[PDB]
Design a protein around this nucleic acid. Structure first.
Lengths: 171, 16, 43, 357, 206, 234, 208, 137
RNA sequence: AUACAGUGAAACUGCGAAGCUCAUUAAAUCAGUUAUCGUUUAUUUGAUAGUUACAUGGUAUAACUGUGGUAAUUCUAGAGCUAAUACAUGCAAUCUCGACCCUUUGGAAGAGAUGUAUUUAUUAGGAUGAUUCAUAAUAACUUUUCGAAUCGCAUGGCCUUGUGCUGGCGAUGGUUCAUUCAAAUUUCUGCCCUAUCAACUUUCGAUGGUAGGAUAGUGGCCUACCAUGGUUUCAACGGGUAACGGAGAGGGAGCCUGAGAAACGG
């Protein structure tokens, strides 16, 4: 039912265009994969050619990157906190790219202890105060940069600096 | 705008 | 605002006309009984 | 009480079902594969199920799926899938207008109401704002859709026009329910209030403030349900507390805590089963059966996978649950009532059934 | 009615028509997978146990597993393509024209047509390890001398015929593996020569 | 589509329009369909060695035909510009060069000339593992090229090894062959390159008769220096 | 051992304790099939803490679910994580299991990734239990004679087999050091003296 | 700059909060070619524009056109008008025509109603926009 | 031919299956041309992967043997076999800095270094007019891909006589790039009368921005918020036409395969 043709739309000068022909599958569009937190469920969908896409209908895990210290750890997703496009996804906790989610700070916490030998050499161990507060609370804010609906992955990166402040004010 | 396309009619003889 | 259906439209829609017919029997309890019980709803 | 899981995955909660399908071809030598029995053929969705409803006639059932967003209809008399039909978007709430499966109305997540006839999709209509619930008034044939905003939309099915929308004091309608005996509509608002609305007129009969002494946290009215008696009214909260109210008095007669703190997804009134003083309250993990008067716990339903919805086959002890697994789970409690007609010889195989506690 | 009884250890099978209804009644209400004692079926079957495996009705349609009914139903079955076809329940009833049974254990008396007769295996092992398993051959022992042969006589001509063993270790397989390895090594060496020549060219240019 | 009318066949093949209903479609290969000469047309309609497609199949099946030093058995293999065709039985070597009219001419060459070909550098870029390579007009991917080689240059490829023996930079005063347009098949020396970024680059070419003409860069093929072509011209 | 697992009363055999000691070693064997067998006989011994978490131990031995099991089962503060009282009984089995997985050679990308997964779960463990895991790898290495005497090398111990075992030890410690780093637990007996012992072996082997 | 629900940033460009070498956030920019000087306001600007020819992921290729600005009321795009004399052979005479082209304009350019803008063709930006402003005058 | 070896029914694999009949439509069909740095692409062509094994399992069955039901079909259930390029599993090297400057090509102590594919983050940045392009590196991720358990012909060179080591020409497979065959969008141009057709659009998106969903990808194509825009008397929009001068396979709805079809298949 979903189609990508521009024929059904109105013209630039604006004549209501008449249907030329029946819908073709080479402008095919598919349904939104409303990814959500929980036990991993991914489906394999056959696309044009021999290429394949992965449909993460459900996912509770993601490889999230601490860009400042340059690492990437696999963490549990806690839930969606803010999504810039529409708040209903936040209310339904739908997982999509650019959605602000809450992730596991435990592996990052252990890693920090191991590499700097300090709870959360000293100057390097110093980090932003807000992120320290996030670790003390035990919940870490992150932004999804992968598309679960195309690659089947929920990778992301930890919010920091200006982006973190902007999203905190938005929250 | 210049087409820069070869045409058969010009090359073929029109003597007849 | 009207575009995409974000505003409610009160015009007729032909396909949905007469999709179902009302049941003339109505609620099992009589109308006066229903009116009485709502007036006392939650004290 | 003995509760039997006739159909559903029988693996550990940690183990996913797709691994079981992987393990399926290795275990095919195992005698258990030959012995195990399925009730309805193709009684599974590819990834997960959202909901499940059974026809009033009692020979047909209907469900929807995650991917491809689909609408399975199962014939009880034939023990098979009648047909499969996709949907452009995922499905949020539906009700079956006709006694059979021929006519149904779906509330999708793209804010579009679609009417599905026997031949196929008839028309799609779009409501102004996102909807979370959908109920049909049989007397007036008016379709009511709860919405994210305060307004509650009115579509009259006779005349084919969007009528004036009921305006609610508070924003967000989670669940709407209509009493057959009285026609009273109880709207489950986001705030801790249930607003009762007048069907023939457009008025608020009363608005009830739910109160919990145990928890001071805010809670959201997730579900509302009316009994066929016309007087007792049930409420489900986001904190896992189910309240039964006699509509005449403000105070709650009984308050029950499910114990897991999850939202109550549905409440089912087991009047038809016999021993009418029974009620089912469904959470994400447990669907619990208990009596309205004493509050005592009789039977607890503990599937290995999260429950999205539960449905009771009228007049029988069969329960149908929509879960996140490939096979939806169907359960039988012999004590509650006899097995359905189409499940005539389910009784013969009760000893072989799992009989989970 | 008719019971098609199969005793698999020999691979034998035979049909018995039972006119009296007593036997058919003791078969009634059972399920494909349940076991029934032979003594109830008859003294000739005394001590036997029968596993019910399926059957066909008076209308010819089979019985199918997974369905607990005594009556006809149309199920959507696959022979990906699926067709809706009529099938019988797994429940034994008076509408069954033939029931198939499997002898789980033997009784006191020996059946004339099943226990007293044998049918040999049609074919023997083909793969080398399958032959070794069939003859318990040690690794040093060669399967080549233990290949099962069948004699064929056409008129006055006679000859023995044996199968082609598969996955057998042979010189040509070793030669192919060695050739592939040598080809890989040669390709790597040629690539290194090309890289070295390119490096020399760059050194000249710089 | 998959069938070609003779009336719709390319003009440059010289094929008579009335011989039959249909013409050969060149198969997939190094050259474009509209810029290739299938071996059936070359061998039957230009060489006259064969009389119908069937003798062409027999000849190719005898493995008597080599295109760029390798045996070809496909009837419709797309031989094209700067392709060397060797027939060992006849001791004949041919190079496909357009005449002034714009058609393939069956130009006989010596063995040394057959040993090498020229390819215009279509693309210069590094592949996986940081290995530079060049893609020529005939689709040859040659790794580890000389750094000075750039796009629009011409590389002399040895057929036996498929390696660049030498190269010519694209510059004014270089000898040039026109491979498209109305000036197709003409030869001349570059005068100036009129660069229109985001558009088709134009080159001015002066012939030995001092006549000047302008042609798009995509139809330009450097073949040597003025008075010293690297190939025997027709 | 498959016969051993189905013994009805394994705890009452003539020699249960030292049989349990050898089974504990087979649980640490590289071959997962031996670990599956070895666990089954260990599970034949009746112990309530084992039966509660029997499924998790089986899932670890399964290769397909090995990764997801670690993230859910062994993550500290996890809902499915072992209870504090049950830590003492369960972890000894845990260490030998992951010790066996670490023994698995990294001849493929899949096999390599499982070693990073095995070594990455040590920070979840509490420190003496991490010390236990290091101690298990050092049990095979025979170093007490070296430090017992005047730091002298025995010719018999100097073999290709001995060096291979030491190469395995040093690789495990290096991976542990990379993960734990400053939080690495350092003990003389468990790690340092096998580590020093191995360096003495390399010098003795190279010169001799 | 941050006047939207989402956070505006140049993709794959990173500013490391710890290192804090420079107060200014790292900015990526390119020259569009065609002898079009990239303006200094784009180089040292703070705007984020995915469709800017100098800082966005858009490339100018194909036709280059010129026109007169007729409308600048909508956000980050304008409508320009190009006129010409079309030949009628039957009368052998010319008639004036005009056409209106919508063109994307980056915030690095300040355009009024009446000035002359040279524009470069690029990939489809929107339903009707196929060009991008590259020089104002 | 004492493993078979010629030919070979059946069956399992591999490849390819992509004229008619109705309607009618004004540069929205079609023709020319531009771009894809915005994309997929079987096949052809050129390059391209050193990271139990003298060869593993049925975790397997067809054809086939035999027992039967049915009025009955390209309808069928039970029992017993047997294989793969079908289904799964899977295995003592090289390159640098190079003291000793020992010998001055040279050896050489010691230090080191060493797949590919997807996703995210980060660093460096030969090609084009232009790139976040190409490539490389780091930290991880993956229902982590692939990296010959295949076949035909020939039986050479060596010796350490063991059937020991080392091997010639092809076929069928496989990652990535380019090429070729195509496909899909896209820039500009292109002879009817027209105002007795002057407003059209937002009429469930109309013009644009931000973010998201989906495509093979750009893009209101669709979705959430925001601005009220866009064409037009230089003819928008609408109407007529010698605009034969695009649709379906009993009728609508839906699904499946494959490189390519919403398939004249199911």
């Amino acid at each position: 039912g979903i189609s990508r043709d521009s024929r059904h739309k109105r013209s630039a000068t604006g004549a209501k265009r008449a249907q030329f022909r029946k819908k073709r599958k080479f402008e095919l569009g598919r349904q939104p994969a409303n990814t959500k937190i929980g036990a991993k469920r991914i489906h394999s969908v056959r696309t044009r050619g021999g290429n394949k896409k992965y449909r993460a209908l459900r996912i509770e895990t993601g490889n999230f990157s601490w860009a400042s210290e340059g690492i990437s750890k696999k963490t549990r997703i806690a839930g969606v906190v803010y999504h810039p496009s529409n708040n209903e996804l936040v209310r339904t906790n739908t997982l999509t790219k650019a959605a602000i989610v809450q992730i596991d700070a435990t592996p990052f916490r252990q890693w920090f202890e191991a590499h700097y030998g300090q709870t959360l050499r000293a100057a390097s161990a110093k980090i932003e105060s807000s992120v320290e507060s996030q670790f003390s609370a035990g919940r870490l804010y992150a932004c999804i940069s992968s598309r679960p609906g195309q690659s089947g992955r929920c990778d992301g990166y930890i919010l920091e600096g200006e982006e973190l402040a902007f999203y905190l004010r938005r929250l | 705008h210049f087409e820069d396309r070869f045409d058969a009619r010009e090359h073929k003889d029109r003597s007849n | 605002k009207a575009s995409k259906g974000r505003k409610l439209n009160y015009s007729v829609q032909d396909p949905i006309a007469n999709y179902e017919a009302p049941i003339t029997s109505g609620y099992k309890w009589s109308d006066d009984q229903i009116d009485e019980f709502f007036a006392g709803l939650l004290g | 009480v003995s509760v039997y899981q006739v159909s559903g995955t029988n693996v550990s909660r940690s183990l996913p079902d797709w691994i079981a399908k992987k393990r399926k071809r290795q275990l095919k030598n195992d005698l258990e594969y030959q012995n195990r029995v399925e009730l309805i053929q193709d009684f599974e969705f590819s990834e997960a199920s959202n909901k499940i409803k059974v026809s009033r006639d009692g020979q047909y059932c209907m469900a929807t799926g995650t991917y491809k967003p689909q609408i399975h209809v199962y014939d009880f008399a034939n023990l098979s899938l009648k047909f499969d039909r996709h949907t452009d978007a995922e499905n949020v709430d539906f009700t079956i207008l006709s006694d059979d499966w021929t006519k149904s109305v779906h509330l999708q997540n793209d804010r579009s109401i679609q009417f599905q006839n026997k031949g196929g999709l008839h028309y799609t209509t779009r409501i102004p704002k996102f909807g979370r619930s959908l109920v049909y008034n049989k007397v007036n044939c008016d379709l009511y859709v709860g919405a994210s905003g305060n307004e509650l939309y009115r579509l009259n099915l006779e005349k084919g026009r969007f009528l004036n929308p009921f305006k609610l004091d508070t924003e967000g309608v989670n669940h709407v329910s209509i009493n057959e005996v009285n026609g009273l509509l109880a709207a489950g608002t986001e705030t801790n209030v249930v607003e009762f609305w007048d069907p023939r007129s457009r008025s608020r009969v009363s608005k009830l403030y739910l109160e919990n002494n145990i928890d001071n946290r805010p809670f959201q009215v997730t579900t509302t349900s009316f009994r066929n008696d016309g007087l007792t009214f049930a409420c489900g909260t986001s904190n896992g507390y189910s309240y039964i109210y006699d509509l005449r008095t403000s105070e709650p007669s009984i308050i029950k805590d499910q114990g897991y703190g999850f939202d109550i997804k549905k409440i089912i009134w087991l009047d038809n089963v016999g021993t009418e003083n029974k009620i089912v309250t469904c959470d994400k993990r447990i669907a619990k059966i208990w009596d309205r008067l004493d509050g005592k716990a009789y039977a607890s339903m503990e599937p290995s996978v999260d429950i999205n919805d539960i449905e009771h086959v009228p007049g029988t002890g069969m329960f149908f649950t929509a879960n996140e697994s490939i096979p939806m789970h169907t359960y039988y409690i012999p004590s509650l009532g006899p097995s359905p007609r189409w499940c005539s010889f389910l009784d013969s195989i009760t000893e072989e059934l799992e009989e989970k506690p | 009615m008719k019971l098609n009884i199969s005793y698999p250890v020999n691979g034998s099978q035979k049909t018995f028509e039972i006119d009296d209804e007593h036997r058919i009644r003791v078969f009634f209400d059972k399920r494909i997978g349940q076991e029934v004692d032979g003594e109830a079926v008859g003294d000739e079957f005394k001590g036997y146990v029968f596993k019910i495996s399926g059957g066909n009705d008076k209308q010819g349609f089979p019985m199918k597993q997974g369905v607990l009914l005594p009556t006809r139903i149309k199920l959507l079955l696959t022979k990906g393509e699926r067709k809706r076809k009529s099938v019988r329940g797994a429940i034994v009833g008076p509408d069954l024209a033939v029931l198939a049974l499997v002898i789980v254990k033997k009784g006191e008396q020996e059946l004339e047509g099943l226990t007293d007769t044998t049918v040999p295996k049609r074919l023997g092992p083909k793969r080398a390890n399958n032959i070794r398993k069939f003859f318990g051959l040690s690794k040093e022992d060669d399967v080549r001398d233990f290949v099962i042969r069948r004699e064929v006589t056409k008129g006055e001509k006679t000859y023995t015929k044996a199968p082609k063993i598969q996955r057998l270790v042979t010189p040509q397989r070793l030669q192919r593996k060695r050739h592939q390895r040598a080809l890989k090594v040669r390709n790597a060496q040629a690539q290194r020569e090309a890289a070295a020549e390119y490096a020399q060219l760059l050194a000249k240019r710089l | 589509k998959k069938h070609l009318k003779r009336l719709a066949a390319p003009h440059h093949w010289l094929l008579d329009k009335l011989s039959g209903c249909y013409a050969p479609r060149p198969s997939a290969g190094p050259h474009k369909l509209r810029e290739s000469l299938p071996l059936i047309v070359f061998l039957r309609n230009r060489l006259k060695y064969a009389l119908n497609g069937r003798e062409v199949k027999a000849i190719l099946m005898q493995r008597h035909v080599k295109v760029d030093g390798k045996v070809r058995t496909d009837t419709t293999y797309p031989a094209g510009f700067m392709d060397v065709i060797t027939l060992d039985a006849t001791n004949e070597n041919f190079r496909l060069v357009y005449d002034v009219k714009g058609r393939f001419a069956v130009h006989r060459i010596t063995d040394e000339e057959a040993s090498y070909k020229l390819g215009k550098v279509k693309k210069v870029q590094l592949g996986k593992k940081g290995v530079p390579y060049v893609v020529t007009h005939d689709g040859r991917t040659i790794r580890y090229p000389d750094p000075n080689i750039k796009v629009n240059d011409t590389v002399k490829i040895d057929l036996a090894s498929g390696k660049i023996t030498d190269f010519i930079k694209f510059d004014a005063g270089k000898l040039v062959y026109v491979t498209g347009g109305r000036n197709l098949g003409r030869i001349g020396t570059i005068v100036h390159k009129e660069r229109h970024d985001g558009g088709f680059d134009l080159v001015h070419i002066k012939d030995s008769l001092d006549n000047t003409f302008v042609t798009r860069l995509n139809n330009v093929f450097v073949i040597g220096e003025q008075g010293k072509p690297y190939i025997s011209l027709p | 051992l498959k016969t051993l697992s189905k013994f009805k009363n394994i705890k009452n055999v003539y020699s249960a304790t030292e049989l349990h000691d050898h089974l504990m070693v087979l649980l640490g064997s590289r071959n997962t099939d031996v670990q599956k067998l070895a666990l089954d006989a260990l599970l034949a011994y009746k112990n309530p803490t084992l039966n509660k978490y029997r499924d998790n131990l089986k899932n670890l031995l399964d290769d397909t679910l090995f990764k997801d099991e670690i993230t859910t089962f062994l993550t500290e503060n996890g809902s499915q994580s072992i209870k504090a009282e049950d830590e003492k009984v369960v972890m000894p089995y845990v260490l030998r299991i992951f010790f066996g997985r670490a023994q698995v050679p990294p001849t493929s990308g899949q096999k390599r990734s499982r070693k990073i997964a095995v070594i990455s779960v040590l920070p979840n463990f509490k420190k003496p239990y991490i010390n236990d895991f290091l101690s298990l790898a050092s049990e095979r290495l025979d170093y007490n004679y070296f430090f017992g005497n005047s730091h002298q090398i025995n010719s018999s111990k100097a073999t290709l087999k001995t060096i291979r075992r030491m190469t395995g030890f040093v690789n495990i410690v290096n991976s542990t050091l990379s993960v734990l780093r400053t939080n690495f637990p350092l003990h003389t007996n468990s790690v340092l003296q096998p580590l020093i012992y191995s360096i003495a072996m390399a010098y003795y082997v190279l010169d001799t | 700059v941050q006047s939207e629900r989402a956070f505006q940033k140049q993709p794959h460009i990173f500013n490391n909060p710890k290192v804090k070498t420079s107060k200014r956030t790292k900015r990526w920019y390119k020259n569009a070619g065609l002898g079009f000087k990239t303006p200094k306001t784009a180089i040292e600007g703070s705007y984020i524009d995915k469709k800017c020819p100098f800082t966005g992921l858009v490339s100018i290729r194909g036709k280059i056109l010129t026109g007169t600005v007729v409308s600048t009321k909508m956000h980050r795009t304008i409508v320009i008008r190009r006129a010409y004399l079309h030949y009628i052979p039957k009368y052998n005479r010319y008639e004036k025509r005009h056409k209106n082209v919508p063109v994307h304009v980056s915030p690095a350019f300040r355009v009024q109603v009446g000035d002359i803008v040279t524009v470069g063709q690029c990939r489809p930006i929107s339903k009707t926009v196929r060009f991008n402003v590259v020089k104002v005058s």
